[PDB]
């Protein structure tokens, strides 16, 4: 039983659906733990392919802005330990992992796209990482992945300067596999994924592994560096005023 | 020795050297330039010849309507004394060595992609210096459909060149690209209309071959040398994986 | 402090370093190498949030000045390779967001350094040319590493090895340039954006850049060193000796 996700599995696809549509799928502490539990189950289940998507209008508005005796410094520590573990589940996820981006995506839900195998977007999806505007720094391994996927010249605009991308721009810049018109989005994506799930399953998993294994150690080191820096930013005056 | 004069005779290739350019042409056009055991070996020989001749630039291209359908699946081989296992090992050693020749090739190496390209002939494109395509070339790596895994260093190069989100569709899910898509995604340098393709590309290559010859070579070396060690390790790892996949049920059934 | 070949200003949280030999298409002479390094050193310590590099007049920069003793040509190529190395090293290490405002044609080292910038904005009149091979030379500015990664090997080759000159639109499509603007609106569009950028939280800007760049710097410094070594030799080859005399003639 999940309180913040709807998780199903059938015919070789596991579907993990963010389910706080009244909060535009903001990721609160509970959803952090539950996404990790869903991923850990999906890593051992019978599915060939695992899909993340959002209920409703938004894919996700990112971290929930609403969440101790040992202080703001110890809440910072425990939040960093948790972020690091959460990102770690995406670095390690051993099967094909697909984002179906049904609408606007923000923050950590965008930065994680650099660790997904494929990303399909509705043309009403947008991609925004306004870290800078909130006195914070990158996470989700995006400090490593975004310059490499997008080019430094483009990644700067998104990561440092908080420019919001359209679906088309995110696709042209390598974050998004393909964009579909919103009225046909759901059909186009599921039809494709159902075909993909009929491919030889050990071949799909083994092909992902030969692509991803040699990079994991570096991604885990990137993730640890990001979380350490981010712990600092949370305790900063710019983060508080913003 | 691999010395020759103007043309080097092969059974599955046409190998010629004029205007400072050694041209290696797949020549099993009836079989869509499918690469059999004989062609793996002749290609490695042709590359050794090309690295040592007086060409400035080297081209790989196909005869007829296809660049290459990739590995020849009609090329059925007897099982040797150590069984299908020994056969999978033998084949893995040969692939590793074949890819290694592309990793190490020291002159500018250009692909002239005249028509459809499949498999190993596509994955190798990530080790090339330039790739020119006809607008009727297509690019297809249907490894998963055959119960196999990536080779040619593509498990490393394609994500980096195309982005992970585009490389996945091609490598894991077997999507076939048009020439325009392959160029948009970084694998192809430039696409030309089929009707003037050969004219335009060869005009350009003949110009390039008149550039200061040693500078061409030294610049490629400064770009490529520091990566070769990693590429070699990637190739070895892909070949070890594939050795296991060739013995799998999924691979058998797929044939 | 005080500049012969640059104009350096600072306002609205932006330090602007402008190449200032417009009668030589902002060619970079030995003096400008040393000045750019002193300017970047100062900009790194001043209270600006963003630093910009641009060129005065019609060119960004035509790149190295070909006009450029005690141990003859042997020890000279050595000095020049030591200076090139130090010059490129300042870009690798520069700690604040570094932006290129490419006002017209760029050539040579002015192009290759763009792989070390944070953002790059171009006028549609700008072009990008690295004719190193034509000149009998090899790559620098870390371009041997950075350009295949940014542009794809297949496109980097055409630039670096074969001397293709890119339009602003092509450079942008291939990852080198952030955004291209019509020449008539370029200055206004860029500076408006940059002025808004300079108002974002400055420690977040600086620290974001740091988490992006820091872990790559070692590698970049190695690539720089290797490139300067090769180039030290190329400068003493018949193809370069010979090419430089032909360009003397232009
Ligand atoms: Cl957190
Ligand atoms: Cl084989
Ligand atoms: Cl110099």
DSSP result, C179-243: EEE-TTTHHHHHHHHHHHHTTS-HHHHHHHHHHHHGGGHHHHHHHHHHHHHHHHHHTTSHHHHHH
The residues facing B171 across adjacent strands are none
Partners of residue C41 on adjacent β-strands: none
Burial of B77 (0-12, 13-18, 19+ CB in 10 A): exposed
Q: In 3D, which of C102, C94, C111 has the Cα closest to residue C39?
A: C94
Q: For residue A16, what are the β-bridge partners?
A: A7, A52
CB B19 within 8 A of CB B206: yes
Residue of B nearest to A198 (CA): B145
Entry field: residues in chain A: 242
- Alpha helices in chain A, H assignment, sequence order: 29-44, 72-92, 108-111, 142-150, 152-159, 167-172, 185-196, 201-234, 237-241
Please name the residues in contact with B219: beta carbons below 8 A apart, sequence gap of 6 or more: C132, C133, C138, C139, C144, C160, C161
> What is the maximum alpha-carbon separation in chain A?
53
The angle subtended at Cα B126 by Cα B166 and Cα B56, nearest 5°, is 150
Tokens matching residue A206: 């083994």
DSSP, collapsed to helix, strand or coil, labels residue A92 as helix
DSSP character for A67?
Answer: -
Provide the edge-to-edge strand list for the sheet that holds A49-54. Answer: A5-10, A13-18, A49-54, A97-101, A118-122, A178-180
Distance separating alpha carbons of residues C193 and C183, to the nearest angstrom: 16
C209 contacts A153? CB cut-off 8 A: no
Smallest CA–CA separation between C77 and chain A, in Å? 32
Residues B232 and C157 sit within 8 Å (Cβ to Cβ): no
CA of C225 to the centre of ligand 3 (A): 14
* Interacting residues of B200 by C-beta distance below 8 A, sequence separation 6+: B192
**Closest Cα partner for A119 from B167, B10, C134?**
B167
Q: Under 8 Å CB-to-CB from A10, ≥6 apart: which residues?
A: none
A108: Cβ–Cβ under 8 A, 6 or more apart, which residues? A27, A62, A63, A83, A139, A140
> How far A56 CA lies from chain C's nearest CA (Å)?
32
Q: How far is A211 from chain B (nearest CA, A)?
A: 5
> By the 8 A CB rule, do A80 and A232 touch?
no
CB B82 within 8 A of CB B103: no
| Token pair for A140 | 């989700």
Q: Quick check: B227 contacting A, CB < 8 Å?
A: no
Q: Domains in chain A and their CATH numbers?
A: 1-197 (3.90.226.10), 198-242 (1.10.12.10)
Ramachandran area for residue C206 (φ above 0: left; ψ -120 to 50: alpha; else beta): alpha
Q: Using CA atoms in the order C2, C4, C5, C9, what is the torsion angle rounded to 10 degrees? A: 30
Ligand minimally distant from the alpha carbon of residue A79: 1
CA nearest to C243 within chain B: B212
Asked if residues B42 and B72 have their Cβ atoms less than 8 Å apart, the reply is no
Neighbours of ion ligand 1 (CB under 5 A): A 79, 82-83
Instruction: Give yes or no for A197 touching B (CB within 8 A).
Output: no
Report the SS3 class of residue A18. Answer: strand
Closest to A36 measured CA to CA, from A105, A87, A112, A95:
A87
- DSSP β-ladder status, A178-180 and A165-166: unpaired
Q: Does residue C203 belong to the interface with chain A, where contact is any CB pair within 8 Å?
A: yes
Residue A116 to residue A121: CA distance in whole angstroms: 13
Residue pointed to by tokens 């994680």: A112
End-to-end CA distance of chain A: 36
Q: Which of A99, A102, A112 is nearest to A32 (CA)?
A: A112
Q: B176: helix, coil or strand?
A: coil
* In contact, A88 and A220? CB cutoff 8 Å: yes
Q: What are the C-alpha distances in Å from B5 to residues A110, A137, B52, C61, C171?
A: 58, 62, 13, 47, 42
**Tokens matching residue A176:** 């998004």
Q: Report yes or no: A152 and C91 within 8 Å, Cβ to Cβ.
A: no
Please report the number of interchain residue pairs, chain B to chain C, with beta-carbon separation below 8 angstroms: 89
Contacts of C136 in chain B (CB under 8 A): 212, 214-215
Which residues of B are documented as binding site? Answer: 69-73
Q: Which two tokens stand for residue B118?
A: 């499949």
Give me the residue label for tokens 């000796």. Answer: C241
Alpha carbons C28 and C59: distance in angstroms, whole number = 12
C-alpha of A14 from chain center: 16
Among C14, C231, C22, C3, smallest CA distance to C119 is for C14
Question: Nearest CA to CA, how far is A119 from chain B (Å)?
Answer: 6
Question: Which are the contacts of B50, defined by CB distance < 8 A and separation ≥ 6?
Answer: B15, B17, B22, B24, B58, B105, B107
Contact of A137 with C205, CB cutoff 8 Å: no
Q: Which residues from chain A sit within 8 angstroms of residue C98, using beta carbons?
A: none
Report CA(B98)–ligand 1 centroid distance (Å): 48
Show the tokens assigned to C236.
Answer: 């003493």
Which residues partner with B42 through β-bridges? none
Computed from CA positions of residues C1, C6, C12, C13, in that sequence, does the dihedral angle turn out positive or negative? negative
Separation CA B254–CA B180 (nearest Å): 30
Q: How far apart are CA B144 and CA B245, in angstroms?
A: 10
Strand pairing class (B21-26; B13-18) = antiparallel
- Three-state DSSP at A185 gives helix
Mark yes or no for CB contact B186/C237 under 8 Å: no
CA-only gyration radius of chain A, Å: 17
The beta-strand segments (E) located in chain B are 7-9, 13-18, 21-26, 57-62, 109-113, 117-118, 130-134, 138-140, 177-178, 190-192
Residue in B160, B188, B214 nearest the CB of C239: B214
Q: What is the number of other CB atoms lying within 10 angstroms of the CB of residue A10? A: 10
DSSP letters spanning C166-191: EEHHHHHHTTS-SEEE-TTTHHHHHH
Alpha-carbon span A8 to C4, nearest angstrom? 69
Q: Is B171 on the interface with A (CB under 8 A)?
A: yes
Q: What is the C-alpha separation between C235 and C249, in angstroms, rounded?
A: 18
Q: Considering only residues 123 to 162 of chain A, which have any Cβ-Cβ distance to chain C shorter than 8 Å?
A: 131-138, 143-144, 147-148, 150-157, 159-162
């Amino acid at each position: 039983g999940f309180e913040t996700l709807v998780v199903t599995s059938e015919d070789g696809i596991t579907k993990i659906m963010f389910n706080r549509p009244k909060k535009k799928n903001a990721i609160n502490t509970e959803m952090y733990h539950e996404i990790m539990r869903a991923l850990k189950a999906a890593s051992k289940d019978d599915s060939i392919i695992t899909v993340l998507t959002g209920n409703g209008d938004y894919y996700s508005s990112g971290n929930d802005l609403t969440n101790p005796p040992g202080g703001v410094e110890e809440k910072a520590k425990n939040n960093a330990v948790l972020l690091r573990e959460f990102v770690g589940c995406f670095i390690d996820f051993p099967k094909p992992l697909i984002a179906v981006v049904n609408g606007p995506a923000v923050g950590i839900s965008v930065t994680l796209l650099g660790l997904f195998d494929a990303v399909y977007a509705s043309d009403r999806a947008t991609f925004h990482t306004p870290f800078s505007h909130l006195g914070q720094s990158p996470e989700g391994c995006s400090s490593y992945t975004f310059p490499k996927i997008m080019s430094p010249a483009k990644a700067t605009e998104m990561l440092i300067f908080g420019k919001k991308l359209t679906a088309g721009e995110a696709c042209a810049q390598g974050l998004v596999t393909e964009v579909f018109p919103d009225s046909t989005f759901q059909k186009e994506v599921w039809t494709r994924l159902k075909a993909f799930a009929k491919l030889p399953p050990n071949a799909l998993r083994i092909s992902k592994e030969v692509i991803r294994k040699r990079e994991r150690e570096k991604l885990h080191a990137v993730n640890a560096e990001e979380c350490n820096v981010l712990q600092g930013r949370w305790l900063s005056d710019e983060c508080t005023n913003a």
